[PDB]
Coordinates of C-alpha atoms and ligand atoms in Angstrom, one line a residue:
Chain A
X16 CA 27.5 0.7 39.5
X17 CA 26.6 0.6 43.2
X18 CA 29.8 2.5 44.1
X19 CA 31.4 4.4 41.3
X20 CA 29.3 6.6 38.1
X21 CA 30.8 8.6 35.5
X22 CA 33.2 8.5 32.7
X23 CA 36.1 6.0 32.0
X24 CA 39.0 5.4 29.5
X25 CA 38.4 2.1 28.2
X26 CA 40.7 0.3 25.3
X27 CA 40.7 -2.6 23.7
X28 CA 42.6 -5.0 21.0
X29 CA 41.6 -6.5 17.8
X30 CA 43.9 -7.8 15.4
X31 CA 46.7 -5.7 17.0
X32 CA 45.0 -2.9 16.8
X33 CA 44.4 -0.5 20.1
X34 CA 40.4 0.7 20.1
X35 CA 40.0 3.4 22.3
X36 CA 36.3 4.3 24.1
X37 CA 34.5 6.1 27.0
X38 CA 32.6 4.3 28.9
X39 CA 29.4 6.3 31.0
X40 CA 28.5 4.2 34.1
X41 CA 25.6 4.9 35.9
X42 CA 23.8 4.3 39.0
X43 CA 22.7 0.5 40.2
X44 CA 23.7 -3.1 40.4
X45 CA 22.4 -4.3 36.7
X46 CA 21.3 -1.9 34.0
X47 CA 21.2 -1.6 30.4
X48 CA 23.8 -0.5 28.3
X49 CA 24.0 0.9 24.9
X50 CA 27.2 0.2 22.3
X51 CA 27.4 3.7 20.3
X52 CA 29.0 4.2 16.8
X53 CA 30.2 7.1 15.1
X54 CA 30.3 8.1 11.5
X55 CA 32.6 8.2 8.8
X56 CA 35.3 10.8 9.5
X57 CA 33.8 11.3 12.9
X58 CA 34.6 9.9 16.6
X59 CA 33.4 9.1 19.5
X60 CA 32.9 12.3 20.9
X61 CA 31.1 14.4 18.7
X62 CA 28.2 16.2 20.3
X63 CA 25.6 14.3 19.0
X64 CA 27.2 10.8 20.5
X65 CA 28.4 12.7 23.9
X66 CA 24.7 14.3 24.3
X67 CA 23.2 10.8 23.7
X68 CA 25.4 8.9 25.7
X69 CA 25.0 11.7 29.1
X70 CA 20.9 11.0 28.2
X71 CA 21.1 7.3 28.4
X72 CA 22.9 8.0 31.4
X73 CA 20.3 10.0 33.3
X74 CA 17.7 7.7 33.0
X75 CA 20.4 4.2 34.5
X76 CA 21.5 3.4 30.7
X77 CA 25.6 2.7 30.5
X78 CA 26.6 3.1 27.6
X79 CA 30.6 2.5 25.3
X80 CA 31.9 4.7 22.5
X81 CA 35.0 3.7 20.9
X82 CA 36.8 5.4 17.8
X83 CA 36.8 3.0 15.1
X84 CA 40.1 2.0 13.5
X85 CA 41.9 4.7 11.3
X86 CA 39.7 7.4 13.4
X87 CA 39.9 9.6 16.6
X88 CA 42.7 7.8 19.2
X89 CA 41.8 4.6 18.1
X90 CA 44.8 2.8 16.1
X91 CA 45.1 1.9 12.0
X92 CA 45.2 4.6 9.2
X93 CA 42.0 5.8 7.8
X94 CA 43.2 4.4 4.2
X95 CA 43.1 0.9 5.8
X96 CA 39.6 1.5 7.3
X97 CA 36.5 -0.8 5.3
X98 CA 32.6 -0.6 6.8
X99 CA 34.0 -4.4 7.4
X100 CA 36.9 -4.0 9.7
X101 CA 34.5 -1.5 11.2
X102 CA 32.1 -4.6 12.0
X103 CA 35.2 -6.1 13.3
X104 CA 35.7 -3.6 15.7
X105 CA 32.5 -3.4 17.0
X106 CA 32.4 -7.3 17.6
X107 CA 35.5 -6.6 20.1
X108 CA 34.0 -4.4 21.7
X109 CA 30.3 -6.4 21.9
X110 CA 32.6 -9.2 23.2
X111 CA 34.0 -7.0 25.9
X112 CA 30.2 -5.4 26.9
X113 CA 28.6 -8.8 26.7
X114 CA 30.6 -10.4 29.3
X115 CA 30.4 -7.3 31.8
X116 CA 28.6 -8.9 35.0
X117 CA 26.3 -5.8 35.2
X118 CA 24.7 -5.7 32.1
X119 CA 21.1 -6.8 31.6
X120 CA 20.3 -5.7 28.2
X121 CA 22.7 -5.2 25.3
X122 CA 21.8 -1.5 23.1
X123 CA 23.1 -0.5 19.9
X124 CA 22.9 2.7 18.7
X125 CA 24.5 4.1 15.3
X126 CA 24.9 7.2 13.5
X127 CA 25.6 7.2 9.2
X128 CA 28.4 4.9 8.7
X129 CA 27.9 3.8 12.3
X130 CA 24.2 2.9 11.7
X131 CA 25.3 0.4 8.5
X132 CA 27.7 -0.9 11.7
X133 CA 25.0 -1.5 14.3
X134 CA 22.5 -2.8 12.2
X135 CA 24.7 -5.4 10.2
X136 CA 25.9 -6.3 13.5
X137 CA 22.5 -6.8 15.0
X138 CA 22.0 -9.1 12.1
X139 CA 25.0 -11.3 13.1
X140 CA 23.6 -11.5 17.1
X141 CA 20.1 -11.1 16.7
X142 CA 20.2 -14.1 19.3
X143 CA 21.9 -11.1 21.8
X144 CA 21.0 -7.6 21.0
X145 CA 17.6 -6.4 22.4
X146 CA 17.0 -3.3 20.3
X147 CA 18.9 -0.7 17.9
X148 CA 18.5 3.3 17.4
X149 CA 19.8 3.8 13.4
X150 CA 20.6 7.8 13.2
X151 CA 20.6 8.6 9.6
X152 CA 22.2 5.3 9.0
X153 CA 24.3 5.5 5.4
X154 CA 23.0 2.3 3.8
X155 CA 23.5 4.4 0.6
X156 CA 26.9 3.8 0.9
X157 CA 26.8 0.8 -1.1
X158 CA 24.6 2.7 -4.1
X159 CA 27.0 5.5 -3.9
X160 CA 30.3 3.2 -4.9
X161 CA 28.5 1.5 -7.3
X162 CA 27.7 4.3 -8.9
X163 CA 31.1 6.0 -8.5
X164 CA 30.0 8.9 -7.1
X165 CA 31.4 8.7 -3.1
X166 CA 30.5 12.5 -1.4
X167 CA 31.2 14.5 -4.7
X168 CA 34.2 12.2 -5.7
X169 CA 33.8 10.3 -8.6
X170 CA 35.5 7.6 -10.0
X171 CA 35.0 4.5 -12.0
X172 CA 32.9 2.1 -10.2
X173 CA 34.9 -1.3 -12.3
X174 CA 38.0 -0.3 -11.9
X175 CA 38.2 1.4 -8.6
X176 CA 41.4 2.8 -8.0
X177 CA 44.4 1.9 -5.5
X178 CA 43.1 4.7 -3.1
X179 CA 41.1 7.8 -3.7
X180 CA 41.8 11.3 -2.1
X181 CA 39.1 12.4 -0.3
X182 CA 39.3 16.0 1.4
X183 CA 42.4 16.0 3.9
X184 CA 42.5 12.3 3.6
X185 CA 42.9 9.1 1.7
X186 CA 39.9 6.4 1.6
X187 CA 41.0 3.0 0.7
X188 CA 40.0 1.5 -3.2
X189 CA 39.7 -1.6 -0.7
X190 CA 37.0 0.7 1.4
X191 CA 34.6 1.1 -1.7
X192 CA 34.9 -2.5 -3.3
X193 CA 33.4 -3.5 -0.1
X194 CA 31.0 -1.2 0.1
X195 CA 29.5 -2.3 -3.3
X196 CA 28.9 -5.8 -2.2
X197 CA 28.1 -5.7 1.1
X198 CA 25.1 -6.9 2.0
X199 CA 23.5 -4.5 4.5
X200 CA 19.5 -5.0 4.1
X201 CA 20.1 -8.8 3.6
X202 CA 22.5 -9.1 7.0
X203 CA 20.4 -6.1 8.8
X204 CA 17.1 -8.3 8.3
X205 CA 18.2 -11.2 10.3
X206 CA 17.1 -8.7 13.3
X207 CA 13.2 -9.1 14.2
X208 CA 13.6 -7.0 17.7
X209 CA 12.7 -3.6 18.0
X210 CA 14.4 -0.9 15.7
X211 CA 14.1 3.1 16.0
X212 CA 14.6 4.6 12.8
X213 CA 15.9 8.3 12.8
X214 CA 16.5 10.8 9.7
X215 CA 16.5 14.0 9.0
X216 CA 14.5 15.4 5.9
X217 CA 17.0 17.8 4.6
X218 CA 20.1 15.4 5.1
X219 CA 21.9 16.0 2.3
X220 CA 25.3 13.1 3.0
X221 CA 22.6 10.0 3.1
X222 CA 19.0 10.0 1.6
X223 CA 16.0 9.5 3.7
X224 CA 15.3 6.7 1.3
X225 CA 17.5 5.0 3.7
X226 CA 15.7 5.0 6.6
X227 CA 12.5 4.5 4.8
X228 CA 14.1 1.1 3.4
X229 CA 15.2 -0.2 6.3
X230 CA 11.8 0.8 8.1
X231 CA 10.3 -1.8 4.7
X232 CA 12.7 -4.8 5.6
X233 CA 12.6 -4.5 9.4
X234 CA 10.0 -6.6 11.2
X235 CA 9.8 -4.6 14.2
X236 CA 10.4 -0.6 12.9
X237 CA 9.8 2.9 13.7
X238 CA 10.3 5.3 11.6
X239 CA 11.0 9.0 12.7
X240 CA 11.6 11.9 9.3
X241 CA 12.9 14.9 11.6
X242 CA 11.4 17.8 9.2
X243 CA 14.1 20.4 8.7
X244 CA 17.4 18.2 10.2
X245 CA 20.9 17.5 9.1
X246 CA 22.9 14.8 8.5
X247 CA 24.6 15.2 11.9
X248 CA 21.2 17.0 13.5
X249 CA 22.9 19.6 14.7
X250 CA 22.1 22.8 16.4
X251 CA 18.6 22.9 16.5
X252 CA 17.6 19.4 15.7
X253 CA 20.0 17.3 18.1
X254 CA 17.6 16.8 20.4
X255 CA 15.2 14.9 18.0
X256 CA 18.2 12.3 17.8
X257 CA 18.5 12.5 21.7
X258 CA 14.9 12.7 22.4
X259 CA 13.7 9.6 20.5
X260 CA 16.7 7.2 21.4
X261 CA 16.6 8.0 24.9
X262 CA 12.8 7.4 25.2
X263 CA 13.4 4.3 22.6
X264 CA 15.6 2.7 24.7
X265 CA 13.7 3.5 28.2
Chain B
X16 CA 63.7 -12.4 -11.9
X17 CA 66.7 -12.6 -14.8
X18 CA 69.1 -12.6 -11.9
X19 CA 67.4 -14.3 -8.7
X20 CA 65.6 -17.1 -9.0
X21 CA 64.3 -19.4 -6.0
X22 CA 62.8 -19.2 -2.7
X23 CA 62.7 -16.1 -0.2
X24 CA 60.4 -15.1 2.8
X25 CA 58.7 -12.1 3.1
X26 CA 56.4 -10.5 5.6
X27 CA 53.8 -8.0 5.4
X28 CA 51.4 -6.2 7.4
X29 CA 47.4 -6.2 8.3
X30 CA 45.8 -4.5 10.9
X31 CA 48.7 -4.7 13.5
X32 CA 49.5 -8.3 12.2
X33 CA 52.1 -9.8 10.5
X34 CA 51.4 -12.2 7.9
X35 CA 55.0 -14.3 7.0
X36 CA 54.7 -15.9 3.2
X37 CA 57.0 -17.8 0.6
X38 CA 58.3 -16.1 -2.5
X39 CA 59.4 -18.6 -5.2
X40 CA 60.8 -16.5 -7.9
X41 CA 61.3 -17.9 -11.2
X42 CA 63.7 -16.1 -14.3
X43 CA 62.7 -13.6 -16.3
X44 CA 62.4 -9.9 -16.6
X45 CA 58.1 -10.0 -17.0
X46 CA 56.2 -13.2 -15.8
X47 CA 53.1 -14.3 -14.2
X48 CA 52.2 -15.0 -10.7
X49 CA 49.9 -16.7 -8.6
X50 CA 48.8 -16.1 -5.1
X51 CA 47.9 -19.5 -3.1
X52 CA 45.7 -19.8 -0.3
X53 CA 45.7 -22.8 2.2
X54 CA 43.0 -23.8 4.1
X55 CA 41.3 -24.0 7.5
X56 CA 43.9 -24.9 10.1
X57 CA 46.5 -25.9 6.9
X58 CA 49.1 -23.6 6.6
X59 CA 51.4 -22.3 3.5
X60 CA 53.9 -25.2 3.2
X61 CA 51.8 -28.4 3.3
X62 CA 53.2 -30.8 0.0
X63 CA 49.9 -29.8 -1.8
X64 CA 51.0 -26.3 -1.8
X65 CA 54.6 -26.6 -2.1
X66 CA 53.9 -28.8 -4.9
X67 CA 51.8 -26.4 -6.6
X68 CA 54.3 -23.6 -6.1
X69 CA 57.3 -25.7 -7.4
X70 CA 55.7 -26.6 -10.3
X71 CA 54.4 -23.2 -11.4
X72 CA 58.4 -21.8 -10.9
X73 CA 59.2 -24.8 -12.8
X74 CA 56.7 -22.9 -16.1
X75 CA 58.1 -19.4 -15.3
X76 CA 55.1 -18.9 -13.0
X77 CA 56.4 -17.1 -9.7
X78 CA 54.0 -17.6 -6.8
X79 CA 53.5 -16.4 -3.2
X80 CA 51.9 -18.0 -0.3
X81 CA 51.2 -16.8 3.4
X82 CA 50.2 -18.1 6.3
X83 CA 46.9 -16.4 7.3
X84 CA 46.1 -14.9 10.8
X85 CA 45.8 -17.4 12.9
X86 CA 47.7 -20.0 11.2
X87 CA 51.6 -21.2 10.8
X88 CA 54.2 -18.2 11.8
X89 CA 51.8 -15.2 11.3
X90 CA 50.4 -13.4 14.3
X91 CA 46.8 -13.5 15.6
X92 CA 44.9 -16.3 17.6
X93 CA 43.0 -19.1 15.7
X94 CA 40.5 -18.4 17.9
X95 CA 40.0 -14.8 16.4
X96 CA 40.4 -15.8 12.5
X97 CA 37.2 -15.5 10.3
X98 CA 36.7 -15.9 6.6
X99 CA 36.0 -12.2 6.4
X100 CA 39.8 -11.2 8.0
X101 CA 41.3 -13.6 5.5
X102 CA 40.3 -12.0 3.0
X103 CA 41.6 -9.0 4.3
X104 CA 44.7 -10.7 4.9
X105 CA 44.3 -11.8 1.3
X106 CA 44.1 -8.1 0.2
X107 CA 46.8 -7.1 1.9
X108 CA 48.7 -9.8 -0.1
X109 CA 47.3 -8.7 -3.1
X110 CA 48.6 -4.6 -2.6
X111 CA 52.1 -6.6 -2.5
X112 CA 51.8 -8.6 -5.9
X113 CA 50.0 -5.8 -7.8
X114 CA 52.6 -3.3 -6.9
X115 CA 55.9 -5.7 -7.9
X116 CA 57.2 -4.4 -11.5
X117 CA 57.7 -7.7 -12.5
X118 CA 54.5 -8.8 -12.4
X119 CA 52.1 -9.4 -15.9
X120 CA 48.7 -11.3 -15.0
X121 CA 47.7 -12.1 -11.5
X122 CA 46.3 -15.7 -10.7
X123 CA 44.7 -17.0 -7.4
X124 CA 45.0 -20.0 -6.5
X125 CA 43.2 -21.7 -3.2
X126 CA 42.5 -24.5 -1.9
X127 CA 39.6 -25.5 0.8
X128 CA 38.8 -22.4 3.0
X129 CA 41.6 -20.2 1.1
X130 CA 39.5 -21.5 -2.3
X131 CA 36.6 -19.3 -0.4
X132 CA 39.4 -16.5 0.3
X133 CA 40.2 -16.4 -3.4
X134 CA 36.8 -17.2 -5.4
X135 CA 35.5 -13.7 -3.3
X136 CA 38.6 -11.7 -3.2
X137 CA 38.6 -12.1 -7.3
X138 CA 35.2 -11.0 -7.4
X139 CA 35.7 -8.4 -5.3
X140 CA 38.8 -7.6 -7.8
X141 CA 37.5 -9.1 -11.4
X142 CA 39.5 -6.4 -13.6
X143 CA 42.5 -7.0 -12.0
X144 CA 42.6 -11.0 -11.6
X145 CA 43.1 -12.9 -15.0
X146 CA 42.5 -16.5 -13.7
X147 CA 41.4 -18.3 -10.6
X148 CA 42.2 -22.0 -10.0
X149 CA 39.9 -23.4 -6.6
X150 CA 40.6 -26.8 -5.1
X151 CA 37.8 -28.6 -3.0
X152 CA 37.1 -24.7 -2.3
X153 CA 34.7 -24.6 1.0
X154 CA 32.1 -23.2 0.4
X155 CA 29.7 -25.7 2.2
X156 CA 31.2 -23.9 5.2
X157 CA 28.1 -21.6 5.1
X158 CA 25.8 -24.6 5.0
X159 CA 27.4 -26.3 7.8
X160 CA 27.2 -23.3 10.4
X161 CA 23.7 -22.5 8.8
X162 CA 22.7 -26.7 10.4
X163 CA 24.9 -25.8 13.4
X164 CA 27.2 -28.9 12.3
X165 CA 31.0 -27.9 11.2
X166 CA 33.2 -30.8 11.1
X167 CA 31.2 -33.2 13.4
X168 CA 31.2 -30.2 16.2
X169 CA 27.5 -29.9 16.6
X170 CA 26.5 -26.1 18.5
X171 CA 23.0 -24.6 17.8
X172 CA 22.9 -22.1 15.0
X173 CA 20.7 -19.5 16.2
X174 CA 22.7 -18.9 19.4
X175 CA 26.3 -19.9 18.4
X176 CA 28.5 -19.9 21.2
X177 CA 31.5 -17.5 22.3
X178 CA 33.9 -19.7 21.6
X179 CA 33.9 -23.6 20.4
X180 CA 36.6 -26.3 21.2
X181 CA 37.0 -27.5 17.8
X182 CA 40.1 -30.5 18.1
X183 CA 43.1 -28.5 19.8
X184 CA 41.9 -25.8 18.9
X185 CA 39.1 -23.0 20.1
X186 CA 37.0 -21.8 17.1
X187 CA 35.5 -18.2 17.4
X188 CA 31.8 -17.9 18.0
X189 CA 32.4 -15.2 15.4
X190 CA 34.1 -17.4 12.7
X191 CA 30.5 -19.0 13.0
X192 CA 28.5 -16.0 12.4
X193 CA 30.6 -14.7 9.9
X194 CA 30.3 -18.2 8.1
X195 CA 26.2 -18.4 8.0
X196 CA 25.7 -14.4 5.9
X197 CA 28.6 -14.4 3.9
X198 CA 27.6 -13.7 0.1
X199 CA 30.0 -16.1 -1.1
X200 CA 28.6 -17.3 -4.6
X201 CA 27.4 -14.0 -5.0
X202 CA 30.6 -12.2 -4.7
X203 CA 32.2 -14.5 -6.4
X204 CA 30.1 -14.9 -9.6
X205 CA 31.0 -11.2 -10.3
X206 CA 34.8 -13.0 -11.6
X207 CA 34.0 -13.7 -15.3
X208 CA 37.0 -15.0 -16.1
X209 CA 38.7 -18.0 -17.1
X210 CA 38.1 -20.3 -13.6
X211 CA 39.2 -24.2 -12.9
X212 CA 37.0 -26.0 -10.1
X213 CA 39.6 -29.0 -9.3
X214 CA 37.5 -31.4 -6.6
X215 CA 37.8 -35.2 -5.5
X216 CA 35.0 -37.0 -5.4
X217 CA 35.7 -39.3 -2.1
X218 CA 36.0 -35.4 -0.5
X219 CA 34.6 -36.5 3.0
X220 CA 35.2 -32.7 4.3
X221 CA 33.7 -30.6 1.7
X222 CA 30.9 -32.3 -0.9
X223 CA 32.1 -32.0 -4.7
X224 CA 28.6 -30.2 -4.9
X225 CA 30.1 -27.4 -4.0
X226 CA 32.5 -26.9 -7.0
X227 CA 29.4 -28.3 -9.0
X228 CA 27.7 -25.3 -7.9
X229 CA 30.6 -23.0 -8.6
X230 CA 30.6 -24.5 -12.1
X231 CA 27.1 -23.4 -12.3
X232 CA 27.3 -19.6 -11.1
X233 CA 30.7 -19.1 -13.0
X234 CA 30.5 -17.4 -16.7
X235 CA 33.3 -19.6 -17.4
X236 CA 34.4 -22.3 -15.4
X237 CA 35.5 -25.8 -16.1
X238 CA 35.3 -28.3 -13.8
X239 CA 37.7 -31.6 -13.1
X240 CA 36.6 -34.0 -10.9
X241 CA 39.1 -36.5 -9.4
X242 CA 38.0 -39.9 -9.2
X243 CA 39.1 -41.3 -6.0
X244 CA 40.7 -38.4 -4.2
X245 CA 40.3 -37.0 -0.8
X246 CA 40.4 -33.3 0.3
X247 CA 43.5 -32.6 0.5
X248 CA 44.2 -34.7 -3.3
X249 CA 46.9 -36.3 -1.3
X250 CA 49.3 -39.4 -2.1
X251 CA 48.6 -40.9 -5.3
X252 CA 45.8 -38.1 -5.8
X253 CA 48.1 -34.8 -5.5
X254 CA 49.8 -34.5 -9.1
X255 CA 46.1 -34.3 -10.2
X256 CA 46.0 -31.0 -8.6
X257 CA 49.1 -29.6 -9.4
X258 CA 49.0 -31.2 -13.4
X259 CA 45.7 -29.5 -13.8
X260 CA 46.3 -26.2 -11.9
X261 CA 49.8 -26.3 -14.0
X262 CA 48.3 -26.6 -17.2
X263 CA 45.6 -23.7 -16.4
X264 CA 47.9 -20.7 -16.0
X265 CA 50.3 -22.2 -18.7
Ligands
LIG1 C1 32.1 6.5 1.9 O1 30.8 6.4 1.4 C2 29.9 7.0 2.0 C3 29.8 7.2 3.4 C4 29.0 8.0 4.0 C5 29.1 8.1 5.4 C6 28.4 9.0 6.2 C7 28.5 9.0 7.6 O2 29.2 8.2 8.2 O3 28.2 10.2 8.0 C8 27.9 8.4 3.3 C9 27.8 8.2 1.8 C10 28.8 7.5 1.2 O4 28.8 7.2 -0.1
LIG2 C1 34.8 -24.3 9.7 O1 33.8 -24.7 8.8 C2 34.3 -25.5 7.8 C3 35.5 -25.3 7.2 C4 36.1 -26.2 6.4 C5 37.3 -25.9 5.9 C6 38.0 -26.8 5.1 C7 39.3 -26.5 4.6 O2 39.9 -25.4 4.8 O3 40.0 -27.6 4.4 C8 35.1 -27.1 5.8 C9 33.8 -27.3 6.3 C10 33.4 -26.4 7.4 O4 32.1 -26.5 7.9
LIG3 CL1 28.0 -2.6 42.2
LIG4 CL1 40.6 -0.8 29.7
LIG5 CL1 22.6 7.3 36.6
LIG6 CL1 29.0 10.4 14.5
LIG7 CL1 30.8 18.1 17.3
LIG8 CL1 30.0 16.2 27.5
LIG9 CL1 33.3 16.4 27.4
LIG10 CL1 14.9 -7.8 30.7
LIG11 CL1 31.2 -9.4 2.8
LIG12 CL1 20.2 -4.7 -1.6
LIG13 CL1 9.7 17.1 13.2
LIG14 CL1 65.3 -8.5 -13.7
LIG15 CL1 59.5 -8.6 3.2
LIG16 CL1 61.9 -20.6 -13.7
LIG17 CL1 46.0 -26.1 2.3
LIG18 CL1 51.7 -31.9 4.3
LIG19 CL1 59.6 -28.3 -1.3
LIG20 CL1 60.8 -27.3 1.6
LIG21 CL1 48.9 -10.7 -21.1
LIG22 CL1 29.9 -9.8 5.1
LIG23 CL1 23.7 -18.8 -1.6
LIG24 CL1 40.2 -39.1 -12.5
LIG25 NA1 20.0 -10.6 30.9
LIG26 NA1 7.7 7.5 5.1
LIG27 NA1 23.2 17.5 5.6
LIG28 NA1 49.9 -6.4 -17.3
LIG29 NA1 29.2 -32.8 -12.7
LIG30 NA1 38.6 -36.5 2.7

């Protein structure tokens, strides 16, 4: 604001659950501010979401990024975490951005399982938010559990089981019976504001088909194939996803 | 089971909340049981429910039922309930009964609101549920928060407010936005099994068109319309509901 910038510790509750986030304040009375969303697995402080939310905030754009439930130091284990509960969590914290005196315009911004997040949540307040960066958004998270084939890990897709190892950690049956249903173009659509579309060509995790779908149903879309990046553009590519949601957003 | 039978509380967790239910436990080593489901602002001891549940013991048929969040002793705010967390809560409820030795088929049974709870968590379940029993089930609360009219409590739909007095209560602006997108004939017409659509026809709250609907998505359904009864099948009305949700599950 007028007196204080930088970084903050923020928490906040939903259904006795303790979210934790950063919030980066910047400069002025009234400004923007972007709600940020990390992956599945991820947190809020990866490089990719720190190096976005330090960009926003050189050009007057505050911004929040909370761990999810069952990630980072946010409360919940992961085995209880759905894309669902994740929506959940991200309408605590809209509640808590949207009724912050200083904010003009509200932002969101998503990455993978993150992008699903923002853009199924712009959907539900298309009335509120003013635009949305997706980052590789995983859409094909639904396709994947129908299929029965989550990240290398197969299973069967009509019987899915009680919970399903997955690397050092346990994902919830509850996560991927969700996942088939939900309705992620169909909610996402309801959004007719701007939308910047960002995907790497080589991303491996979450087709390009993705982006390239959502880029058909949106009525306001642009779409950005970064030739050569990641799922997580890293290294060489992480300013593509810094670059374009920065200048996206103003 | 073949040495406790009657009532017994138990409580389980979601999220941070307790949820506080009813056990009635009938004799037997192996039986059936139902999960039922009250409805919006109800709670799990109204005489319709009790009713139910006593009747089912009285055919071997153990039951639970569970206050959702929000409602009767379990934790959480009204304020903050949606149809999406009660089916999480309804989940939750479901890990408990799947997991309990004793148990042979699993029925849901839910009336109003908690018929919407049950008609999508058994599609989001169909090879583990073996018969679902919904009673003036609400699904017309999509309709009526699509028109921006729930209950005579008129708000406009395409910017639905934080938070809506609704009687003594506050209803979530969320609740709302939840209601309008959620899949819920198409989640639940995944459930293939044997289903019985139990509705009164002077229903005031929730038109009998919806169960005429269900009937129609359903693979196999059978629908009972009660000449004369209200929504909550009550007084002279309420052994209709219990006779025919009785006789269903055996
Ligand atoms: C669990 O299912 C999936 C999730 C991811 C998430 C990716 C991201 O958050 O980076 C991608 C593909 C999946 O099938
Ligand atoms: C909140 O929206 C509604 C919910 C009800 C619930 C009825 C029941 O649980 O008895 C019916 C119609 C509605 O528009
Ligand atoms: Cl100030
Ligand atoms: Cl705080
Ligand atoms: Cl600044
Ligand atoms: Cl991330
Ligand atoms: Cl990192
Ligand atoms: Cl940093
Ligand atoms: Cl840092
Ligand atoms: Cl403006
Ligand atoms: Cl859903
Ligand atoms: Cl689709
Ligand atoms: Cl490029
Ligand atoms: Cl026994
Ligand atoms: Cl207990
Ligand atoms: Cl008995
Ligand atoms: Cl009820
Ligand atoms: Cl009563
Ligand atoms: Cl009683
Ligand atoms: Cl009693
Ligand atoms: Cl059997
Ligand atoms: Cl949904
Ligand atoms: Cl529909
Ligand atoms: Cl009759
Ligand atoms: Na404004
Ligand atoms: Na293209
Ligand atoms: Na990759
Ligand atoms: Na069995
Ligand atoms: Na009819
Ligand atoms: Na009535």
């Amino acid at each position: 604001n007028l007196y204080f910038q930088g970084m903050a510790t923020i928490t906040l509750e939903r259904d006795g659950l303790q979210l934790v986030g950063t919030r980066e304040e910047p400069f002025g009375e009234i400004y923007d501010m972007a709600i940020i969303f990390h992956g599945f697995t991820a947190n809020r402080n990866t490089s990719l979401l720190r190096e976005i939310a330090n960009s926003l905030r050189d050009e007057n754009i505050a911004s929040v990024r909370f761990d999810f439930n069952g990630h980072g130091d946010s409360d919940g284990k992961f085995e209880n975490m759905t894309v669902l509960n994740e929506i959940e969590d991200a309408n605590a914290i809209l509640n808590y951005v949207k009724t912050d005196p200083h904010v003009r315009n509200i932002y969101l911004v998503g990455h993978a399982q993150g992008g699903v997040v923002a853009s199924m949540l712009a959907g539900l307040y298309p009335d509120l938010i003013k635009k949305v960066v997706l980052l590789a958004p995983a859409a094909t998270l639904k396709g994947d559990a129908l299929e029965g084939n989550t990240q290398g890990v197969t299973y069967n897709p009509d019987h899915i089981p009680d919970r399903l190892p997955f690397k050092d950690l346990t994902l919830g049956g509850f996560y991927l019976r969700i996942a088939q249903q939900l309705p992620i173009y169909e909610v996402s659509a309801q959004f007719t504001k701007p939308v910047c579309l960002i995907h790497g060509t080589d991303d491996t995790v979450v087709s390009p088909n993705a982006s390239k779908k959502y880029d058909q149903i949106y009525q306001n879309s642009t779409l950005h194939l970064i030739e050569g990046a990641d799922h997580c553009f890293s290294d060489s590519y992480q300013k593509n996803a810094v670059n374009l949601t920065t200048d996206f957003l103003q």
